[PDB]
Amino acid sequence: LKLAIPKGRLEEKVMTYLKKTGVIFERESSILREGKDIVCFMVRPFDVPTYLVHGVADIGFCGTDVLLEKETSLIQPFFIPTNISRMVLAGPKGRGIPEGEKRIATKFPNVTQRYCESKGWHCRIIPLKGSVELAPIAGLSDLIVDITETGRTLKENNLEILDEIFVIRTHVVVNPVSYRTKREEVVSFLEKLQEVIEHDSNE
Amino acid sequence: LKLAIPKGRLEEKVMTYLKKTGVIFERESSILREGKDIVCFMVRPFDVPTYLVHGVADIGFCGTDVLLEKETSLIQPFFIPTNISRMVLAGPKGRGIPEGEKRIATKFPNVTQRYCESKGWHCRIIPLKGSVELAPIAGLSDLIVDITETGRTLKENNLEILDEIFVIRTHVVVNPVSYRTKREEVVSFLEKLQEVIEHD
């Protein structure tokens, strides 16, 4: 089994689940963790789906933000409970929402496009790579769509949450092809993972 | 004047240069530094061009990589000479270039697409966000197009350089609108900066 693990925020949770299921690594680097019958590809979160879709990994993990920002046909075998953070709409405190076309800066343009559509809004979406909270103060946009965990970064930049778009959690996704060619091996691993994951997230 | 400063690797050098011109900050945060007449937006390198539009920022700094990857209409008066790094074609040590279609992973798909066209190659480009050196190792691609500085990340992953695409330098870029509406002030700053670059 080859796994695509999301570096960053979800990295320790996922690796601890793997540790809890019995996985042991003999050789470890920044990009690659190798054990008997198991190899972990440590990749950027948005590259998880790519590794699976291209078929070089069997199972992968990513947050809801990745899953909703880039649609794939990956299979989600089960639900991982813990809410890690939230995707919200935010803008300069007290100033509300623009009447006409809304300028929204974000790292998640598709998510943002989808949200605007559901609101019947006219939006002008400005894609950014990070530090999205700087957009409103610089005059680049009126609002932003971004992730928040406690609201600290928004608060400190005097932005306020105007709407909660979706709660973000960790997801397990499986390469369809692997699901059929290594069926019992994948089922088995997935059963143990779920056992461990259920426990971890709830108790 | 509003400046778009690339966060990260080039940050303090640029800030030192600004400091040498006579900039004086009154308030400073991780994403914004403001003082009499000059405001700095500390943004991701790839976002520098996106802030140099309409009336948001006036002058910015970014690598050749950003400029060649993203089609921009920016005025480019000059650049900072230092050879920070290089955009290269790389692959597993000894394997060379695969015949026919080459699978290339990269964080710079447009650059790779242009590169392949210039070689007459049929390529299958796989965009990645980071740790591009893992692709060849994992079997995701045959080759990579990525930035190298010391060559250590490539060398320690048994990847060798197959071709130097371009040297990367820090370009000074200016919003065309700003160059029209704040000509004197933009030019005044650029001369002070160009003098500091030289001396240094």
Short mmCIF file of all heavy atoms in Angstrom, two decimals, chain A residues 2 7 31-32 41-44 46-47 50-51 54 56 126-135 137-140 157, chain B residues 31-32 41-44 46-47 50-51 53 55-56 70 124 126-131 133-135 137-140 157:
data_model
loop_
_atom_site.label_atom_id
_atom_site.label_comp_id
_atom_site.label_asym_id
_atom_site.label_seq_id
_atom_site.Cartn_x
_atom_site.Cartn_y
_atom_site.Cartn_z
N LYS A 2 0.48 2.19 -0.89
CA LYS A 2 1.14 3.50 -0.98
C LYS A 2 0.14 4.57 -0.57
O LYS A 2 -0.97 4.60 -1.09
CB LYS A 2 1.65 3.74 -2.39
CG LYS A 2 2.86 2.89 -2.76
CD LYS A 2 2.90 2.65 -4.26
CE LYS A 2 4.18 1.95 -4.68
NZ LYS A 2 5.16 2.88 -5.31
N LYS A 7 1.05 17.21 3.99
CA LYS A 7 1.99 17.89 4.88
C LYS A 7 1.23 19.07 5.49
O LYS A 7 0.24 19.52 4.91
CB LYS A 7 3.19 18.45 4.12
CG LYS A 7 4.23 17.43 3.72
CD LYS A 7 5.49 17.58 4.58
CE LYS A 7 6.60 18.27 3.81
NZ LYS A 7 6.95 17.51 2.57
N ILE A 31 10.20 13.76 2.39
CA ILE A 31 9.24 13.43 1.37
C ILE A 31 8.78 11.99 1.35
O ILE A 31 7.77 11.70 0.69
CB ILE A 31 9.86 13.76 -0.03
CG1 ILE A 31 11.01 12.81 -0.31
CG2 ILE A 31 10.28 15.22 -0.09
CD1 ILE A 31 11.84 13.13 -1.54
N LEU A 32 9.48 11.07 2.03
CA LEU A 32 9.12 9.66 1.90
C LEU A 32 9.25 8.82 3.15
O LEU A 32 10.34 8.76 3.74
CB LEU A 32 10.06 9.11 0.80
CG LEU A 32 9.82 7.65 0.39
CD1 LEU A 32 8.45 7.48 -0.23
CD2 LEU A 32 10.91 7.18 -0.57
N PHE A 41 3.95 8.93 0.92
CA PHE A 41 4.38 10.06 0.10
C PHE A 41 3.92 11.33 0.83
O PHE A 41 2.71 11.54 0.98
CB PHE A 41 3.71 9.97 -1.28
CG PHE A 41 4.10 8.81 -2.15
CD1 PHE A 41 3.13 8.11 -2.87
CD2 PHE A 41 5.41 8.42 -2.30
CE1 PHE A 41 3.47 7.04 -3.69
CE2 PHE A 41 5.76 7.35 -3.11
CZ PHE A 41 4.81 6.65 -3.80
N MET A 42 4.83 12.10 1.39
CA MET A 42 4.53 13.32 2.14
C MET A 42 4.44 14.48 1.15
O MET A 42 5.46 14.90 0.58
CB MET A 42 5.60 13.56 3.20
CG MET A 42 5.94 12.33 4.05
SD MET A 42 4.52 11.71 4.98
CE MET A 42 4.07 13.14 5.94
N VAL A 43 3.22 14.87 0.79
CA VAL A 43 3.03 15.87 -0.25
C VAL A 43 2.19 17.06 0.21
O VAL A 43 1.54 17.00 1.26
CB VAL A 43 2.37 15.25 -1.50
CG1 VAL A 43 3.16 14.07 -2.03
CG2 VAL A 43 0.93 14.84 -1.20
N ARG A 44 2.22 18.12 -0.59
CA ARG A 44 1.34 19.28 -0.25
C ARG A 44 -0.10 18.76 -0.31
O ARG A 44 -0.40 17.93 -1.16
CB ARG A 44 1.55 20.41 -1.21
CG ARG A 44 2.90 21.05 -1.34
CD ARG A 44 3.54 21.53 -0.08
NE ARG A 44 2.62 22.09 0.91
CZ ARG A 44 2.88 22.09 2.22
NH1 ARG A 44 4.02 21.58 2.68
NH2 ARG A 44 1.99 22.61 3.06
N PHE A 46 -2.99 19.89 -1.50
CA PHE A 46 -3.62 19.93 -2.80
C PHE A 46 -3.05 18.93 -3.79
O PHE A 46 -3.70 18.65 -4.81
CB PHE A 46 -3.58 21.35 -3.42
CG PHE A 46 -4.85 22.09 -3.06
CD1 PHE A 46 -4.95 22.77 -1.86
CD2 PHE A 46 -5.94 22.03 -3.91
CE1 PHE A 46 -6.13 23.42 -1.51
CE2 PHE A 46 -7.12 22.68 -3.56
CZ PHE A 46 -7.20 23.37 -2.37
N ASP A 47 -1.91 18.32 -3.51
CA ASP A 47 -1.30 17.34 -4.42
C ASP A 47 -1.73 15.93 -4.08
O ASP A 47 -1.47 14.95 -4.82
CB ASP A 47 0.21 17.49 -4.35
CG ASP A 47 0.73 18.78 -4.96
OD1 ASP A 47 0.08 19.36 -5.86
OD2 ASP A 47 1.82 19.21 -4.56
N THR A 50 -4.04 14.51 -6.81
CA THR A 50 -3.24 14.30 -8.00
C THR A 50 -2.51 12.96 -7.95
O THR A 50 -2.51 12.26 -8.97
CB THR A 50 -2.18 15.43 -8.15
OG1 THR A 50 -2.90 16.67 -8.23
CG2 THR A 50 -1.32 15.24 -9.39
N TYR A 51 -1.91 12.62 -6.81
CA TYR A 51 -1.16 11.38 -6.65
C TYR A 51 -2.08 10.17 -6.77
O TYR A 51 -1.68 9.12 -7.30
CB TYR A 51 -0.38 11.33 -5.34
CG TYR A 51 0.99 11.99 -5.42
CD1 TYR A 51 1.15 13.36 -5.45
CD2 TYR A 51 2.14 11.20 -5.45
CE1 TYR A 51 2.41 13.95 -5.53
CE2 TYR A 51 3.40 11.77 -5.54
CZ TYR A 51 3.52 13.15 -5.57
OH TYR A 51 4.78 13.70 -5.65
N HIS A 54 -3.65 10.01 -10.57
CA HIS A 54 -2.63 9.51 -11.47
C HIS A 54 -2.28 8.05 -11.16
O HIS A 54 -1.43 7.48 -11.83
CB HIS A 54 -1.36 10.38 -11.45
CG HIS A 54 -1.46 11.60 -12.31
ND1 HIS A 54 -2.17 12.73 -11.93
CD2 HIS A 54 -0.99 11.86 -13.54
CE1 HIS A 54 -2.10 13.63 -12.90
NE2 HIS A 54 -1.39 13.13 -13.88
N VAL A 56 -0.53 6.71 -8.60
CA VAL A 56 0.74 6.30 -8.00
C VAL A 56 0.57 6.02 -6.51
O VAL A 56 1.46 5.44 -5.92
CB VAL A 56 1.89 7.28 -8.26
CG1 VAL A 56 2.15 7.38 -9.77
CG2 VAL A 56 1.58 8.65 -7.70
N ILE A 126 -10.58 37.05 -6.95
CA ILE A 126 -9.13 37.27 -7.08
C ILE A 126 -8.36 36.17 -6.35
O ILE A 126 -8.31 36.18 -5.12
CB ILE A 126 -8.76 38.63 -6.47
CG1 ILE A 126 -9.57 39.75 -7.14
CG2 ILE A 126 -7.27 38.92 -6.58
CD1 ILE A 126 -10.02 40.82 -6.16
N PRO A 127 -7.74 35.27 -7.09
CA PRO A 127 -7.01 34.16 -6.51
C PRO A 127 -5.71 34.62 -5.88
O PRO A 127 -4.98 35.43 -6.47
CB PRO A 127 -6.75 33.21 -7.67
CG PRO A 127 -7.56 33.71 -8.82
CD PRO A 127 -7.75 35.19 -8.57
N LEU A 128 -5.44 34.12 -4.69
CA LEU A 128 -4.19 34.45 -3.99
C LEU A 128 -3.53 33.16 -3.49
O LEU A 128 -4.21 32.14 -3.44
CB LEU A 128 -4.43 35.40 -2.82
CG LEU A 128 -4.80 36.84 -3.14
CD1 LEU A 128 -5.21 37.61 -1.89
CD2 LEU A 128 -3.65 37.54 -3.87
N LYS A 129 -2.29 33.23 -3.02
CA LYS A 129 -1.61 32.03 -2.53
C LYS A 129 -1.52 31.98 -1.01
O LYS A 129 -1.20 30.93 -0.46
CB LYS A 129 -0.19 31.96 -3.12
CG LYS A 129 -0.20 31.95 -4.65
CD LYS A 129 -0.48 30.56 -5.19
CE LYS A 129 -1.11 30.60 -6.57
NZ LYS A 129 -2.62 30.55 -6.44
N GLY A 130 -1.76 33.08 -0.31
CA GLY A 130 -1.60 33.10 1.16
C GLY A 130 -1.71 34.55 1.65
O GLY A 130 -1.87 35.49 0.85
N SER A 131 -1.79 34.73 2.95
CA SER A 131 -1.97 36.03 3.56
C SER A 131 -3.16 36.75 2.92
O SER A 131 -3.09 37.95 2.66
CB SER A 131 -0.71 36.90 3.43
OG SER A 131 0.28 36.35 4.30
N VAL A 132 -4.26 36.02 2.75
CA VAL A 132 -5.45 36.54 2.12
C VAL A 132 -6.08 37.64 2.94
O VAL A 132 -6.75 38.51 2.39
CB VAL A 132 -6.50 35.42 1.86
CG1 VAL A 132 -7.67 35.94 1.04
CG2 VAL A 132 -5.83 34.27 1.09
N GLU A 133 -5.87 37.68 4.24
CA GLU A 133 -6.41 38.69 5.12
C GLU A 133 -5.87 40.09 4.83
O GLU A 133 -6.41 41.06 5.34
CB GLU A 133 -6.15 38.32 6.60
CG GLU A 133 -4.67 38.46 6.97
CD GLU A 133 -3.91 37.17 6.72
OE1 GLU A 133 -4.51 36.21 6.19
OE2 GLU A 133 -2.71 37.11 7.05
N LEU A 134 -4.83 40.23 4.02
CA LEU A 134 -4.26 41.51 3.65
C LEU A 134 -5.05 42.17 2.52
O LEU A 134 -4.99 43.39 2.39
CB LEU A 134 -2.81 41.35 3.19
CG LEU A 134 -2.04 42.60 2.78
CD1 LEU A 134 -2.02 43.64 3.90
CD2 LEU A 134 -0.61 42.23 2.38
N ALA A 135 -5.80 41.38 1.74
CA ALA A 135 -6.54 41.89 0.62
C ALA A 135 -7.45 43.08 0.87
O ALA A 135 -7.37 44.04 0.12
CB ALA A 135 -7.31 40.77 -0.09
N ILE A 137 -7.57 45.34 3.44
CA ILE A 137 -6.83 46.51 3.89
C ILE A 137 -6.02 47.14 2.77
O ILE A 137 -5.85 48.37 2.75
CB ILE A 137 -5.97 46.21 5.13
CG1 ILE A 137 -5.91 47.46 6.03
CG2 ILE A 137 -4.58 45.73 4.78
CD1 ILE A 137 -7.18 47.64 6.86
N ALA A 138 -5.56 46.37 1.79
CA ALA A 138 -4.80 46.90 0.67
C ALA A 138 -5.72 47.43 -0.43
O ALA A 138 -5.26 47.99 -1.41
CB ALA A 138 -3.90 45.80 0.09
N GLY A 139 -7.03 47.23 -0.34
CA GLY A 139 -7.96 47.67 -1.37
C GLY A 139 -8.08 46.72 -2.55
O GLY A 139 -8.72 47.04 -3.56
N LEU A 140 -7.46 45.53 -2.47
CA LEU A 140 -7.51 44.55 -3.55
C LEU A 140 -8.92 43.95 -3.67
O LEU A 140 -9.39 43.58 -4.75
CB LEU A 140 -6.52 43.42 -3.24
CG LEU A 140 -5.78 42.70 -4.34
CD1 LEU A 140 -5.42 41.26 -3.95
CD2 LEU A 140 -6.44 42.76 -5.69
N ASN A 157 -6.80 41.49 12.32
CA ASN A 157 -6.76 42.28 11.10
C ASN A 157 -8.10 43.01 10.90
O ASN A 157 -8.46 43.38 9.79
CB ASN A 157 -6.47 41.38 9.90
CG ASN A 157 -5.02 40.94 9.91
OD1 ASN A 157 -4.17 41.67 9.40
ND2 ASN A 157 -4.74 39.78 10.49
N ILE B 31 2.31 41.27 7.71
CA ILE B 31 1.80 41.44 6.37
C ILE B 31 1.79 42.89 5.89
O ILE B 31 1.54 43.15 4.71
CB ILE B 31 0.35 40.90 6.27
CG1 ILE B 31 -0.50 41.49 7.40
CG2 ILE B 31 0.34 39.38 6.32
CD1 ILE B 31 -1.98 41.15 7.33
N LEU B 32 2.07 43.84 6.79
CA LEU B 32 2.04 45.24 6.41
C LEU B 32 2.99 46.12 7.20
O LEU B 32 3.10 46.06 8.43
CB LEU B 32 0.61 45.79 6.61
CG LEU B 32 0.42 47.28 6.30
CD1 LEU B 32 0.38 47.51 4.79
CD2 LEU B 32 -0.88 47.80 6.91
N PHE B 41 3.15 46.01 1.31
CA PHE B 41 2.28 44.84 1.49
C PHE B 41 3.18 43.60 1.36
O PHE B 41 3.80 43.42 0.31
CB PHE B 41 1.15 44.84 0.49
CG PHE B 41 0.30 46.08 0.47
CD1 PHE B 41 0.12 46.79 -0.71
CD2 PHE B 41 -0.35 46.50 1.61
CE1 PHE B 41 -0.69 47.92 -0.71
CE2 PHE B 41 -1.16 47.63 1.62
CZ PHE B 41 -1.32 48.34 0.45
N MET B 42 3.29 42.81 2.42
CA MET B 42 4.17 41.64 2.43
C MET B 42 3.36 40.44 1.96
O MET B 42 2.48 39.94 2.66
CB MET B 42 4.76 41.40 3.81
CG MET B 42 5.19 42.64 4.57
SD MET B 42 6.51 43.58 3.73
CE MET B 42 7.72 42.24 3.59
N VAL B 43 3.53 40.08 0.69
CA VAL B 43 2.69 39.05 0.09
C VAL B 43 3.49 37.88 -0.44
O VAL B 43 4.72 37.88 -0.45
CB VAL B 43 1.88 39.70 -1.07
CG1 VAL B 43 0.94 40.79 -0.56
CG2 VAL B 43 2.81 40.26 -2.14
N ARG B 44 2.78 36.82 -0.83
CA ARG B 44 3.48 35.66 -1.39
C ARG B 44 4.07 36.11 -2.74
O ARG B 44 3.43 36.86 -3.49
CB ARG B 44 2.55 34.48 -1.60
CG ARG B 44 1.56 34.14 -0.53
CD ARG B 44 2.00 34.30 0.88
NE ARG B 44 3.33 33.83 1.21
CZ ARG B 44 3.84 32.63 0.98
NH1 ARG B 44 3.12 31.71 0.36
NH2 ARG B 44 5.09 32.34 1.36
N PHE B 46 4.21 34.85 -5.68
CA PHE B 46 3.36 34.74 -6.85
C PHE B 46 2.22 35.74 -6.87
O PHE B 46 1.57 35.88 -7.89
CB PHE B 46 2.80 33.32 -7.05
CG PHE B 46 3.62 32.54 -8.06
CD1 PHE B 46 4.75 31.86 -7.65
CD2 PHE B 46 3.26 32.50 -9.39
CE1 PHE B 46 5.51 31.14 -8.56
CE2 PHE B 46 4.00 31.78 -10.31
CZ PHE B 46 5.14 31.10 -9.89
N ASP B 47 1.90 36.37 -5.75
CA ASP B 47 0.85 37.35 -5.64
C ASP B 47 1.34 38.77 -5.94
O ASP B 47 0.51 39.69 -6.02
CB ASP B 47 0.24 37.29 -4.22
CG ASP B 47 -0.50 35.98 -4.00
OD1 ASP B 47 -0.90 35.30 -4.97
OD2 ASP B 47 -0.70 35.62 -2.83
N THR B 50 -0.40 40.31 -8.90
CA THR B 50 -1.83 40.51 -8.65
C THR B 50 -2.12 41.72 -7.80
O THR B 50 -3.19 42.34 -8.02
CB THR B 50 -2.59 39.23 -8.32
OG1 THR B 50 -3.37 39.23 -7.14
CG2 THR B 50 -1.73 38.01 -8.39
N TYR B 51 -1.18 42.21 -7.01
CA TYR B 51 -1.35 43.45 -6.27
C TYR B 51 -0.97 44.67 -7.12
O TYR B 51 -1.27 45.82 -6.74
CB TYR B 51 -0.53 43.49 -4.98
CG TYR B 51 -1.21 42.86 -3.78
CD1 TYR B 51 -1.26 41.48 -3.62
CD2 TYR B 51 -1.81 43.65 -2.80
CE1 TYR B 51 -1.88 40.90 -2.54
CE2 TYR B 51 -2.43 43.07 -1.70
CZ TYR B 51 -2.48 41.71 -1.58
OH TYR B 51 -3.12 41.13 -0.49
N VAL B 53 -2.11 46.20 -9.74
CA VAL B 53 -3.20 46.48 -10.65
C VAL B 53 -4.02 47.69 -10.18
O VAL B 53 -3.97 48.06 -9.01
CB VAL B 53 -4.20 45.31 -10.79
CG1 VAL B 53 -3.52 44.03 -11.21
CG2 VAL B 53 -4.99 45.14 -9.50
N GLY B 55 -5.61 50.68 -8.77
CA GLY B 55 -5.00 51.52 -7.74
C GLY B 55 -4.61 50.76 -6.49
O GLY B 55 -4.69 51.37 -5.40
N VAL B 56 -4.12 49.51 -6.55
CA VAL B 56 -3.75 48.85 -5.27
C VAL B 56 -2.29 48.99 -4.96
O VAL B 56 -1.95 49.60 -3.92
CB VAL B 56 -4.40 47.51 -5.01
CG1 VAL B 56 -5.13 46.92 -6.21
CG2 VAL B 56 -3.50 46.46 -4.36
N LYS B 70 3.55 33.65 -15.03
CA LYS B 70 2.32 34.43 -15.12
C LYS B 70 2.49 35.53 -16.17
O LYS B 70 3.44 36.31 -16.09
CB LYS B 70 2.03 35.08 -13.76
CG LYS B 70 0.57 35.09 -13.35
CD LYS B 70 0.43 35.32 -11.84
CE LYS B 70 -0.98 34.95 -11.39
NZ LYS B 70 -1.02 34.56 -9.95
N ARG B 124 3.62 15.69 -21.09
CA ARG B 124 2.43 15.55 -20.24
C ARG B 124 2.82 16.25 -18.91
O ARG B 124 3.66 15.77 -18.18
CB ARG B 124 1.99 14.14 -20.02
CG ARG B 124 0.87 14.02 -18.98
CD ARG B 124 -0.49 14.08 -19.63
NE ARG B 124 -1.51 13.33 -18.90
CZ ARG B 124 -1.44 12.03 -18.60
NH1 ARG B 124 -0.36 11.33 -18.95
NH2 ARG B 124 -2.42 11.42 -17.94
N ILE B 126 2.37 17.79 -15.22
CA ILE B 126 1.67 17.52 -13.96
C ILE B 126 1.98 18.62 -12.94
O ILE B 126 3.04 18.63 -12.34
CB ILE B 126 2.08 16.16 -13.37
CG1 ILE B 126 1.83 15.04 -14.42
CG2 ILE B 126 1.33 15.82 -12.10
CD1 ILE B 126 2.66 13.81 -14.19
N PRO B 127 1.05 19.54 -12.75
CA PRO B 127 1.20 20.63 -11.81
C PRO B 127 1.23 20.13 -10.37
O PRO B 127 0.42 19.28 -9.98
CB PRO B 127 -0.02 21.52 -12.00
CG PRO B 127 -0.74 20.99 -13.17
CD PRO B 127 -0.27 19.59 -13.43
N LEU B 128 2.17 20.64 -9.60
CA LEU B 128 2.31 20.27 -8.19
C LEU B 128 2.50 21.59 -7.42
O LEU B 128 2.80 22.61 -8.06
CB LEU B 128 3.48 19.33 -7.96
CG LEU B 128 3.35 17.88 -8.48
CD1 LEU B 128 4.62 17.09 -8.18
CD2 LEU B 128 2.14 17.19 -7.86
N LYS B 129 2.28 21.58 -6.12
CA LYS B 129 2.40 22.79 -5.31
C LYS B 129 3.73 22.83 -4.57
O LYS B 129 4.09 23.89 -4.05
CB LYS B 129 1.26 22.87 -4.29
CG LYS B 129 -0.13 22.86 -4.87
CD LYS B 129 -0.44 24.12 -5.68
CE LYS B 129 -1.92 24.13 -6.03
NZ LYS B 129 -2.38 25.47 -6.46
N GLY B 130 4.42 21.69 -4.42
CA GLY B 130 5.70 21.72 -3.71
C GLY B 130 6.32 20.34 -3.66
O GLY B 130 5.74 19.36 -4.17
N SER B 131 7.52 20.23 -3.10
CA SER B 131 8.21 18.94 -3.04
C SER B 131 8.13 18.22 -4.37
O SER B 131 7.84 17.01 -4.48
CB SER B 131 7.57 18.07 -1.94
OG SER B 131 7.52 18.82 -0.74
N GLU B 133 10.47 17.26 -6.29
CA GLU B 133 11.47 16.21 -6.39
C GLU B 133 10.95 14.82 -6.06
O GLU B 133 11.58 13.82 -6.41
CB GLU B 133 12.69 16.55 -5.54
CG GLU B 133 12.48 16.51 -4.03
CD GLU B 133 11.83 17.73 -3.44
OE1 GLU B 133 11.55 18.72 -4.16
OE2 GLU B 133 11.56 17.75 -2.22
N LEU B 134 9.80 14.70 -5.41
CA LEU B 134 9.20 13.43 -5.08
C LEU B 134 8.58 12.75 -6.30
O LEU B 134 8.57 11.52 -6.40
CB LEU B 134 8.14 13.60 -3.98
CG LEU B 134 7.41 12.36 -3.48
CD1 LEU B 134 8.43 11.36 -2.89
CD2 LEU B 134 6.38 12.68 -2.42
N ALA B 135 8.16 13.54 -7.31
CA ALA B 135 7.47 13.00 -8.46
C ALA B 135 8.19 11.89 -9.19
O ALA B 135 7.61 10.81 -9.40
CB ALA B 135 6.97 14.09 -9.41
N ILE B 137 10.65 10.04 -8.18
CA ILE B 137 10.86 8.98 -7.21
C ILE B 137 9.61 8.14 -7.01
O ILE B 137 9.69 6.90 -6.92
CB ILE B 137 11.25 9.61 -5.85
CG1 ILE B 137 12.32 10.68 -6.03
CG2 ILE B 137 11.67 8.54 -4.86
CD1 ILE B 137 13.59 10.26 -6.71
N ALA B 138 8.45 8.77 -6.95
CA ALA B 138 7.19 8.09 -6.77
C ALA B 138 6.63 7.51 -8.06
O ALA B 138 5.59 6.86 -8.04
CB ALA B 138 6.15 9.06 -6.18
N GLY B 139 7.24 7.82 -9.20
CA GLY B 139 6.73 7.32 -10.47
C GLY B 139 5.63 8.20 -11.04
O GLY B 139 4.93 7.77 -11.96
N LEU B 140 5.44 9.40 -10.50
CA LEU B 140 4.41 10.31 -11.02
C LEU B 140 4.88 10.95 -12.31
O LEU B 140 4.10 11.22 -13.23
CB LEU B 140 4.03 11.40 -10.00
CG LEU B 140 3.02 12.45 -10.48
CD1 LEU B 140 1.67 11.80 -10.74
CD2 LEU B 140 2.89 13.58 -9.46
N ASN B 157 18.45 13.56 -3.69
CA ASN B 157 17.34 12.74 -4.13
C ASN B 157 17.71 12.01 -5.42
O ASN B 157 16.85 11.59 -6.17
CB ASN B 157 16.07 13.57 -4.35
CG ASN B 157 15.45 13.92 -3.01
OD1 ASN B 157 14.97 13.02 -2.33
ND2 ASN B 157 15.50 15.18 -2.62
#
